Amino acid sequence: HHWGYGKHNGPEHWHKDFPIAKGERQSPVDIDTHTAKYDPSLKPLSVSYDQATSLRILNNGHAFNVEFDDSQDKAVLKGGPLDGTYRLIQSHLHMGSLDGQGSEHTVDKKKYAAELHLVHWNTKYGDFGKAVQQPDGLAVLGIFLKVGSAKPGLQKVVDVLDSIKTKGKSADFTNFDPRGLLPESLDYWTYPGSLTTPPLLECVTWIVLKEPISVSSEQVLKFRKLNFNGEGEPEELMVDNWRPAQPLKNRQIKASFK
């Protein structure tokens, strides 16, 4: 079978096809605020998404995805713990089957209903494929979702989710603004980690936003109606596609706030 989140192909199995699964820099991790430490050396985080330009949304059988045009520095990430410019290439959503779970990272063991990931690559490598092969090739912004008031920025995509219900489906979508996913505050935690899905490469500088954004019950439920399976196959809801917290292995989690 292909890796996934089921009993026979889930996170606990990954290590057999990807030994790195048991690495020293694996993600996600639980953010222990008693341990996380404020770092003065961190510069202001710069999230320039004004020129952002989305291309399409798609169901790859692993999570809801949206691809961006990364040919130019239209939507980039700089500052914070980053050296240079990191270009936004894609974003995906880790969702739970229940409100009390779904987020990959946890804060003092607390899980959120979901977690969005905005992936950027170090332009110093000229290509996303080459960046993932480097320790500092990726910068992923993590954003926690909790239920409550509806997130205006999510409604547009939420209304067309049926067009990418099953694996392998995709739909053009040029108006997905990642700016509309950001919380008010940009306070965050950083730490060296990896991709949270195979190949689990440890090429990521994680920037997890402290403040979660709100999404309505209805928006969450629409996201939970997506399928892991393909068309014609037995329905398997795309829920609980999150990897649990991995060992911190003495890595240091830095806070951008006092």
8 is annotated as contributing to ligand binding: no
Nearest approach, Cβ of residue 164 and Co ion (Å)? 17
Nearest CA-CA partner of 160 in 63, 54, 64: 64
How many amino acids of this chain bind Co ion (CB under 5 A)? Answer: 2
Residue 212 β-bridge partners: none
State which residue, 90 or 256, has the beta carbon closest to Co ion: 90
State which residue, 80 or 102, has the beta carbon closest to Co ion: 102
Q: Which two tokens stand for residue 108?
A: 């003092």
State which residue, 51 or 194, has the beta carbon closest to Co ion: 194
197 is annotated as contributing to ligand binding: yes
Touching Co ion, residues 13-72 (CB under 5 A):
none
State which residue, 145 or 152, has the beta carbon closest to Co ion: 145
* Residue 1: active-site member: no
For residues 191 and 125, is the Cβ–Cβ distance under 8 A?
no
What's the DSSP call for residue 110? B
The H-assigned helical ranges of 107-192 are: 128-131, 152-158
Catalytic residue selected from 13, 62, 105, 120: 62
Encoded amino acid at 213, one letter: I
Is residue 243 a contact residue for Co ion (CB under 5 A)? no
1 is annotated as contributing to ligand binding: no
- Measured CA to CA, the distance from residue 250 to residue 171 in angstroms comes to 42
- Measured CA to CA, the distance from residue 215 to residue 212 in angstroms comes to 10
For residues 166 and 60, is the Cβ–Cβ distance under 8 A?
no
Is residue 117 a contact residue for Co ion (CB under 5 A)? yes
Is residue 105 a contact residue for Co ion (CB under 5 A)? no
- Measured CA to CA, the distance from residue 32 to residue 192 in angstroms comes to 15
Mask of contacts with Co ion, 185-214, x by CB under 5 A? -----------x------------------
Residue 116 β-bridge partners: 93, 143
196 is annotated as contributing to ligand binding: yes
Binding residues for substrate: 196-197
* Interacting residues toward Co ion by CB under 5 A: 117, 196
Binding residues: 92, 94, 117, 196-197
